[PDB]
Amino acid sequence: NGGMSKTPEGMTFATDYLLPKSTANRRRPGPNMNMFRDMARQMSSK
């Protein structure tokens, strides 16, 4: 016991897990377009 080293090596890789995949995604603005957003929300009633 009291192993000098730890972990199960496992079967494979860690080689190509480097490239992440995600829908960032895009940029709905949300901040300083608030004044513009209010006008757009206000416009919706029509």
Partner: protein, 160 residues
């Protein structure tokens, strides 16, 4: 502005400014009080101008707010309501400078390629500029709607 457009025209001919050109600056500088007074009516009431011309564009082109559109939903319409803030800022920079080069460097050169990449129809946002001409003339005077409205008719032909 007026003088730095006429300087760079007078550099390619390699000559001083003509007396037929210098009275243009002389008339513009003395008529500088009136054009600033045009510009405050644009800035001081611009929440009326965007909201009315935004309603006029979506009635003249109701295909924009449809599903499958560019300005569809609450968020994507809000920048098309904010893009008309940007073009109205260039007209009220233009009438103070009296010329077209503060408009021409900021919003005219790359605008064929810009909205091409973003997926919007270019003439539809250019149609809302034409509706923004009509509201900005309605709050303006007799002579002032013709002088300050001429740069509005520049910009519709800029994109088209």
């Amino acid at each position: 502005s007026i003088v730095t457009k006429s300087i760079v025209n007078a550099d390619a001919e390699a000559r001083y400014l003509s007396p037929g050109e210098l009275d243009r600056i002389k008339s513009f500088v003395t008529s500088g009080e009136r054009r600033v007074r045009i510009a405050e009516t644009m800035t001081g009431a611009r929440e009326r101008i965007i909201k009315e011309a935004g309603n006029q564009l979506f009635q003249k082109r109701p295909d924009v707010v449809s599903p499958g559109g560019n300005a569809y939903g609450e968020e994507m319409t809000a920048t098309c309501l904010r893009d008309l803030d940007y073009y109205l800022r260039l007209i009220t920079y233009g009438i103070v400078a009296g010329d077209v080069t503060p408009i021409e460097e900021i919003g005219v050169v790359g605008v064929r390629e810009m909205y091409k990449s973003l997926g919007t129809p270019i003439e539809a946002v250019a149609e809302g500029v034409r509706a923004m001409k009509s509201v900005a003339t309605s709050l303006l005077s007799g002579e002032d709607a013709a002088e300050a409205g001429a740069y509005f008719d520049y910009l519709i032909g800029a994109m088209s």
